[PDB]
Amino acid sequence: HMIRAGIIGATGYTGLELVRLLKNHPEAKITYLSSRTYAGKKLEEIFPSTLENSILSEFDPEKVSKNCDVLFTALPAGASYDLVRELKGVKIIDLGADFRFDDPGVYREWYGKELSGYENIKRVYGLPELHREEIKNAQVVGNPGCYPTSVILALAPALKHNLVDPETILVDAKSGVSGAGRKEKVDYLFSEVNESLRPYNVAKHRHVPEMEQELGKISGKKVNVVFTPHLVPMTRGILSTIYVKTDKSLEEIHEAYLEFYKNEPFVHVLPMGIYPSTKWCYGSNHVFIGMQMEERTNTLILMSAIDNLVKGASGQAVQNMNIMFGLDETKGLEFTPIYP
Amino acid sequence: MIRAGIIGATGYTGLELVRLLKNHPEAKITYLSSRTYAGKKLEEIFPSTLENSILSEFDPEKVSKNCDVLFTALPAGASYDLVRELKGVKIIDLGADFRFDDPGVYREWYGKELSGYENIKRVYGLPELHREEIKNAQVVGNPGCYPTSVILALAPALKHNLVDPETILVDAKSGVSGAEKVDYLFSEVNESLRPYNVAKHRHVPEMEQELGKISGKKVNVVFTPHLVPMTRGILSTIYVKTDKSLEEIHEAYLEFYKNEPFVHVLPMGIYPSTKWCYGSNHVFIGMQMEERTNTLILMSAIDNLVKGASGQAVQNMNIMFGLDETKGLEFTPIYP
Amino acid sequence: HMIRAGIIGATGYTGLELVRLLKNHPEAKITYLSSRTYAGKKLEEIFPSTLENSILSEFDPEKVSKNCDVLFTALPAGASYDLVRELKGVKIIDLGADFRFDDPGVYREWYGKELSGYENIKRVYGLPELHREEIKNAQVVGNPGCYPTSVILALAPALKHNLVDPETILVDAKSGVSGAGRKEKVDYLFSEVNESLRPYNVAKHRHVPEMEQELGKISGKKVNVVFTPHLVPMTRGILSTIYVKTDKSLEEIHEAYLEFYKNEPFVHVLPMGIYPSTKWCYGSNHVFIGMQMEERTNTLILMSAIDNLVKGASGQAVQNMNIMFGLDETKGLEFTPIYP
Amino acid sequence: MIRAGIIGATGYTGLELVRLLKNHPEAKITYLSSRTYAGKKLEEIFPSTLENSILSEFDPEKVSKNCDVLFTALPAGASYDLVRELKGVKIIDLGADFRFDDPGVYREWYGKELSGYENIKRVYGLPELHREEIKNAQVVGNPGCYPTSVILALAPALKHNLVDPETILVDAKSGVSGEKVDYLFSEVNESLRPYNVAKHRHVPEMEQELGKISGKKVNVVFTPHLVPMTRGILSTIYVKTDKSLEEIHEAYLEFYKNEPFVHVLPMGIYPSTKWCYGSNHVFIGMQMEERTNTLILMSAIDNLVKGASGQAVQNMNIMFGLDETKGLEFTPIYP
């Protein structure tokens, strides 16, 4: 029996990537797509690259409940929370931030909406490499942000084994344009962004409390992250360069990373002194981690690269769906990066 | 499982063969060679591949032993030479050594004599035109990337006598991966567009060969390629005179391709973007008419590394081993 | 006499390039700037790159008439025409199409507005390499479109000397995105354009009748242009590839081209066998032309490259300003392309 | 009219020197040499230069004859060597030969002992810090591109004791222009990568200049990244502070108020690299992470102009008593 999958907000870039992934997934099929703007059209009329002849639906919760086992939501902040209340017997994988936070007061501070009744929702942060045991039994998964995915994966072995000083962590992060999310104003025009790099939302970015939640959970201690994102003139990819103090040797750390990720099919620890290129990830669910030590100041440099649209969004969402349905976690995700 | 080897696994077409073949449900990589990087695992050179096979130094005895089929991506003429040394291995050459029906034409444009050619059971590997002959071929001459785009763009028009085949103008645009010396450096190519090899490109006689077979009349092509600052994709803008209506031609295109899983004729008024093909074996074709001059404008887009090279190579293999033509190739373009 | 220059629509990309040129121009200075979107803001608050602290005005004809000897206008279609009636004693160089056409019925057909009173206006098409003699004494110049500038410069010697068959000319052109301007439509978003090439407006583009007008005048014959533009994933630059039948040799045509442009400072006929790269023009008012013959069909291929924002727009405008005020035509335009 | 020679005219820094000197009202090119293309017209190699001059095979007699000032763009150590065998010529070295005060630092990092160094009147060619010394130099080590961005970002903070100078972290991003198979278009396009992490030759150069300004030892952690664009450097700098962001911004406005090429942006506004494009201008922004008291400074330059050839011309102007902006007055090309 094929998992029956629905996508709300199917015409955004993360929706398109769920379409690609689910079409290829040998144990799932698309039974529902919705869009407000394009309701009534075949998805391939809007995006011929999708090769998807399915008509876009105007969202109706009874139709979803009848036609879907699982539903991916890619919607403006707060919309998934509201629409999910009406559904019956459908597992939810939300690509936004509505279900990411353990404490709904933090979501409210950063996203400006109260999540009434949160205490009744069995939700989990969808990072399989940290939470697969809980994801297995979840009804609602809050799919991680793209920067948090890159960062938490970069830091987990270090924090789990207290190999670094987690009190202050510096994160200088570089993302292709698709990683800033749905943004159609002047600053995201080709002519503005092309051939230019810029910092944005320096130190106050909604991803910070999210990273901190997960990093603090691992370490057992409050983690304050200093976070600077930069918009890079390429479509996709994230490189997070992470700086933290340590009194350990690079060798001990590298062994610890190897050990931690040895059975994780999507995370690849590089040899010491080899640093990741973002395009090594292109189109795939794979993550590459490299590291260096600055010896004079005892500063560990961790470098993690992911494809923000895949392991940073829709690939990880499918990964979560596999876990929730008890499938081999690489199902529909067994393919390699596209290069060059 | 089909046992597949790749000679020249560290070129871009090689890397895409590796991607496609790893994912192929009825085939597996049993051999990989590299003149430059032998003795290293493929993923040491190109981590993106995630392939731990050590790269071999080419040895025909090992190939004959381990491979049912061999993909070759070499300097011109080299595939011709190494294929003599092999026996009982099917060959799909990504180069030009086996493309031409008349080896005199190859000689003229590639400056090498192909001895004993008439004794080689070879075929031009464009499945949408020659799948019945590829089925029984021992050696396939995998089409070049511009010809793939041009021939697919013009096939219905020429088959159905809907245009004047006499003179066809082809203005083509390729990303860099499909056209390294100092001129192919990032700072040189970036943020610039240039024509190259104008009306003197080795793909021209290749096009004329295939286009004339379809037409049943002589075709002269005027061909201008242009280097575009992006990594991949081809768009061929084709101009030809016609006395037929656009509606007529469009209906003909839909009919011609109706059962072809990799060619997609767009709705009238809609023009292809090259990135609509990205990473996939799929082709999009659009058209317009300039009505005052009775000029049909055909536009086709392909990913030059996939349908333009390695995907077509895999498609050809499927045909040769009696597999469903789309095996290993079903997946859709990546976007954006 | 520093020439006093006003710019209407200072915050579009052609307006920005006018500011860069005119700040550097030794015999002109900016005395008026207006903007419909950003009036009341300093230009450098919108575009810090401009390094221009002047406050952007809300357009007022009295102030223009008072403070300017010349006025560049970059407005939507029809707008420059309307405002020009309300003005006196000011030369006008319109970057749009309102004054480009000899026949206002052709303009109406393609741009949809009626230009009443047109035959009282002494306007001239501002292509200096063809019309500098008339531009000298004009009060209103319709500054050519960017694709026309490339195409006419590519064809002029051939048509003037009857070296080709001008009845049917096929033009396959390629432009960077900046041709579109700073218009926030989703198609012009970085993520949509990047890494892709697309034809657009095939055989139905407003520049066609404008090309045909100028090409007809210099051939003395009716010219039908078949024109396919393509959007290229780069910011600036136009390459026009032009196909025309000829009974002459390439050697004779090359000879005629060299002779025709021998004394034009901005047009550079390349060596035979050499083709232009668009970036060779970057930031400058210079043009490169190459050519080839396809001998079996007697098809001449002409290739011309310009920077669309400079010789294709604001640079050509300043060149026309120099001509109109009797200055050395290269003034403020002496700089060479920036490379790489 | 100053007579300028360029040794190494077919590199990118050479090409920008040609464009800038051609436009310079009070200088002119009297010598062009190329180790690679000697014998050919410059425009046979780069048609965009519009330069029909034939490239010379370097002859120090013809140089001594024909130039007041020479710009050198050669492989490291290469001049030094020919510099000493010249006289009556101002030298602006675009390489690292003359940047270092301690030539032992140069030899450990660049692998070459510089004998006779101590009696050469050389200076570090950063006008915004050293113009008075540059005024009377006969040799300038033109600063590397990354140090240029990093030092201008930090100068007011270090000068006015506004930050803990003890440990400074620099995460730098550069366009490709800032050779082999991995510099090919298809390799670099649509990809970002760190390189030379922790171990980069520009680190000792920064620590030299930052220490001078603070009057206290400065340790720099520096990590560069290759960005898929042609030009532009963005340096993102992290440093602990006990001062308010407001006070730091005021100090930056004061320190740079009379500096024509350095522009401190309003608070909240961060620089785009393309805002500098083709120009000698610098943009600085900043923010505070309040919980940790971490200052984030951000500077953007054009690596080929203020990072290389434009700073060089700025230095020529100073050496010859010209307005520092001569030939450099033009604004960024945008978009």
Short mmCIF file of N, CA and C in Angstrom, two decimals, chain A residues 262-335:
data_model
loop_
_atom_site.label_atom_id
_atom_site.label_comp_id
_atom_site.label_asym_id
_atom_site.label_seq_id
_atom_site.Cartn_x
_atom_site.Cartn_y
_atom_site.Cartn_z
N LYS A 262 28.82 7.38 11.78
CA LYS A 262 29.21 6.19 11.04
C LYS A 262 28.04 5.42 10.47
N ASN A 263 26.90 5.42 11.15
CA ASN A 263 25.72 4.73 10.63
C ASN A 263 24.62 5.63 10.08
N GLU A 264 24.95 6.91 9.88
CA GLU A 264 24.00 7.90 9.37
C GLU A 264 24.23 8.06 7.87
N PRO A 265 23.31 7.59 7.05
CA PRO A 265 23.54 7.57 5.62
C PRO A 265 23.61 8.94 4.99
N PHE A 266 23.07 9.97 5.66
CA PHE A 266 23.04 11.30 5.01
C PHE A 266 24.11 12.27 5.48
N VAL A 267 24.94 11.90 6.45
CA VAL A 267 25.93 12.83 6.98
C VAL A 267 27.32 12.25 6.77
N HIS A 268 28.14 13.02 6.08
CA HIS A 268 29.45 12.60 5.67
C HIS A 268 30.50 13.51 6.30
N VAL A 269 31.24 12.95 7.26
CA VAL A 269 32.39 13.61 7.87
C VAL A 269 33.62 13.50 6.95
N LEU A 270 34.13 14.63 6.50
CA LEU A 270 35.25 14.63 5.58
C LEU A 270 36.57 14.36 6.33
N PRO A 271 37.59 13.93 5.61
CA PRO A 271 38.93 13.87 6.21
C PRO A 271 39.34 15.22 6.76
N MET A 272 40.12 15.26 7.85
CA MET A 272 40.63 16.55 8.35
C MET A 272 41.37 17.34 7.26
N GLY A 273 41.20 18.66 7.29
CA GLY A 273 41.82 19.51 6.30
C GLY A 273 41.12 19.61 4.95
N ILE A 274 40.00 18.89 4.77
CA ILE A 274 39.20 18.93 3.53
C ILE A 274 37.91 19.64 3.90
N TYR A 275 37.56 20.66 3.12
CA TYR A 275 36.46 21.56 3.43
C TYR A 275 35.35 21.46 2.37
N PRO A 276 34.10 21.50 2.79
CA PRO A 276 33.02 21.26 1.84
C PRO A 276 32.69 22.45 0.92
N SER A 277 32.34 22.08 -0.30
CA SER A 277 31.73 22.97 -1.28
C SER A 277 30.23 22.73 -1.22
N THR A 278 29.43 23.77 -1.20
CA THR A 278 27.96 23.56 -1.19
C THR A 278 27.37 22.72 -2.35
N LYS A 279 27.93 22.81 -3.55
CA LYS A 279 27.41 22.11 -4.68
C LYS A 279 27.67 20.62 -4.61
N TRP A 280 28.51 20.15 -3.68
CA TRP A 280 28.63 18.70 -3.44
C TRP A 280 27.32 18.06 -3.00
N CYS A 281 26.39 18.88 -2.54
CA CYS A 281 25.07 18.46 -2.05
C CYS A 281 23.93 18.53 -3.04
N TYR A 282 24.18 19.17 -4.19
CA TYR A 282 23.13 19.67 -5.04
C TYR A 282 22.04 18.68 -5.37
N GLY A 283 20.82 19.03 -4.99
CA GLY A 283 19.66 18.23 -5.26
C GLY A 283 19.42 17.05 -4.35
N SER A 284 20.28 16.84 -3.38
CA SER A 284 20.29 15.62 -2.58
C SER A 284 20.03 15.91 -1.12
N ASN A 285 19.81 14.82 -0.39
CA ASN A 285 19.59 14.88 1.01
C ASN A 285 20.86 14.74 1.85
N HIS A 286 22.03 14.87 1.23
CA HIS A 286 23.32 14.60 1.88
C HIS A 286 23.98 15.86 2.49
N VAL A 287 24.75 15.65 3.55
CA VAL A 287 25.38 16.73 4.30
C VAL A 287 26.88 16.40 4.40
N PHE A 288 27.73 17.40 4.17
CA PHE A 288 29.18 17.19 4.31
C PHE A 288 29.68 18.08 5.43
N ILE A 289 30.50 17.51 6.32
CA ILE A 289 31.07 18.26 7.43
C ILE A 289 32.59 18.16 7.39
N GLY A 290 33.22 19.32 7.46
CA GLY A 290 34.67 19.43 7.59
C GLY A 290 35.01 20.26 8.83
N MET A 291 36.28 20.25 9.20
CA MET A 291 36.72 20.98 10.36
C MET A 291 38.21 21.32 10.27
N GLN A 292 38.55 22.39 10.97
CA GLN A 292 39.93 22.84 11.16
C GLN A 292 40.06 23.38 12.59
N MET A 293 41.29 23.45 13.07
CA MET A 293 41.61 24.07 14.34
C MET A 293 42.52 25.26 14.15
N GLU A 294 42.18 26.38 14.79
CA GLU A 294 43.12 27.49 14.92
C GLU A 294 43.86 27.28 16.25
N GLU A 295 45.12 26.86 16.15
CA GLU A 295 45.90 26.38 17.32
C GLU A 295 46.20 27.49 18.34
N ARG A 296 46.48 28.72 17.90
CA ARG A 296 46.92 29.76 18.84
C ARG A 296 45.84 30.15 19.82
N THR A 297 44.58 30.10 19.41
CA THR A 297 43.46 30.55 20.26
C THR A 297 42.56 29.39 20.70
N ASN A 298 42.86 28.18 20.24
CA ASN A 298 42.07 26.98 20.56
C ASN A 298 40.63 27.06 20.06
N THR A 299 40.49 27.53 18.82
CA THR A 299 39.19 27.72 18.19
C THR A 299 38.97 26.62 17.16
N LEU A 300 37.89 25.87 17.37
CA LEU A 300 37.45 24.85 16.42
C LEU A 300 36.62 25.55 15.38
N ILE A 301 36.93 25.24 14.12
CA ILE A 301 36.13 25.66 12.97
C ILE A 301 35.44 24.44 12.34
N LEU A 302 34.11 24.45 12.42
CA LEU A 302 33.28 23.42 11.83
C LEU A 302 32.61 24.00 10.60
N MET A 303 32.58 23.24 9.53
CA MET A 303 31.97 23.72 8.30
C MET A 303 30.98 22.69 7.82
N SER A 304 29.70 23.05 7.74
CA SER A 304 28.67 22.08 7.25
C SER A 304 27.96 22.66 6.02
N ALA A 305 27.81 21.82 5.01
CA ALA A 305 27.12 22.20 3.78
C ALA A 305 25.92 21.29 3.58
N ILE A 306 24.80 21.87 3.17
CA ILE A 306 23.58 21.16 2.76
C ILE A 306 22.95 21.90 1.58
N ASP A 307 22.09 21.17 0.87
CA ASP A 307 21.17 21.77 -0.09
C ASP A 307 19.99 22.22 0.73
N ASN A 308 19.80 23.52 0.80
CA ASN A 308 18.72 24.09 1.63
C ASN A 308 17.30 23.67 1.24
N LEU A 309 17.09 23.28 -0.03
CA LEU A 309 15.75 22.94 -0.48
C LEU A 309 15.46 21.49 -0.27
N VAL A 310 16.50 20.73 0.00
CA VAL A 310 16.35 19.30 0.11
C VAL A 310 16.59 18.89 1.57
N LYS A 311 17.83 18.69 2.02
CA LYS A 311 18.02 18.33 3.41
C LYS A 311 17.61 19.49 4.32
N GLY A 312 17.67 20.71 3.81
CA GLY A 312 17.18 21.85 4.55
C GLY A 312 15.70 22.09 4.50
N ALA A 313 14.95 21.27 3.74
CA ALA A 313 13.49 21.48 3.61
C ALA A 313 12.80 20.19 3.24
N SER A 314 12.52 19.99 1.95
CA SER A 314 11.65 18.94 1.46
C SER A 314 12.20 17.54 1.51
N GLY A 315 13.53 17.39 1.39
CA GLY A 315 14.14 16.07 1.55
C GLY A 315 14.01 15.54 2.98
N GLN A 316 14.31 16.40 3.93
CA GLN A 316 14.17 16.07 5.33
C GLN A 316 12.72 15.81 5.72
N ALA A 317 11.80 16.49 5.06
CA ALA A 317 10.37 16.28 5.27
C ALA A 317 9.96 14.85 4.86
N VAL A 318 10.47 14.39 3.71
CA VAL A 318 10.23 13.04 3.20
C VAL A 318 10.88 11.98 4.12
N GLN A 319 12.12 12.27 4.54
CA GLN A 319 12.85 11.50 5.56
C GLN A 319 11.98 11.28 6.80
N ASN A 320 11.42 12.37 7.33
CA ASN A 320 10.40 12.33 8.43
C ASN A 320 9.17 11.48 8.10
N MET A 321 8.61 11.64 6.90
CA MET A 321 7.51 10.83 6.48
C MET A 321 7.90 9.32 6.52
N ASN A 322 9.12 8.99 6.05
CA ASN A 322 9.55 7.56 6.05
C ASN A 322 9.53 7.00 7.47
N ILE A 323 10.07 7.80 8.40
CA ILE A 323 10.16 7.40 9.82
C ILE A 323 8.76 7.20 10.44
N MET A 324 7.87 8.15 10.18
CA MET A 324 6.52 8.10 10.71
C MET A 324 5.75 6.91 10.21
N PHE A 325 6.04 6.44 9.00
CA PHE A 325 5.35 5.28 8.42
C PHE A 325 6.12 3.97 8.52
N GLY A 326 7.27 4.00 9.19
CA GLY A 326 8.09 2.81 9.43
C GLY A 326 8.80 2.25 8.22
N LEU A 327 9.08 3.12 7.25
CA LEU A 327 9.85 2.72 6.08
C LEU A 327 11.33 2.96 6.31
N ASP A 328 12.14 2.22 5.56
CA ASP A 328 13.56 2.49 5.46
C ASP A 328 13.71 3.97 5.22
N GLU A 329 14.53 4.58 6.04
CA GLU A 329 14.59 6.02 6.12
C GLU A 329 15.19 6.68 4.86
N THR A 330 15.96 5.92 4.08
CA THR A 330 16.44 6.39 2.80
C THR A 330 15.49 6.20 1.65
N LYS A 331 14.28 5.69 1.87
CA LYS A 331 13.34 5.45 0.77
C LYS A 331 13.02 6.72 0.04
N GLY A 332 13.14 6.71 -1.30
CA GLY A 332 12.90 7.94 -2.09
C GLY A 332 13.98 8.99 -1.94
N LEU A 333 15.05 8.64 -1.23
CA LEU A 333 16.11 9.58 -0.97
C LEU A 333 17.47 8.95 -1.32
N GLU A 334 17.48 7.91 -2.16
CA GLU A 334 18.68 7.05 -2.31
C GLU A 334 19.64 7.58 -3.38
N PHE A 335 19.39 8.78 -3.87
CA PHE A 335 20.09 9.28 -5.06
C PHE A 335 21.15 10.30 -4.70
#
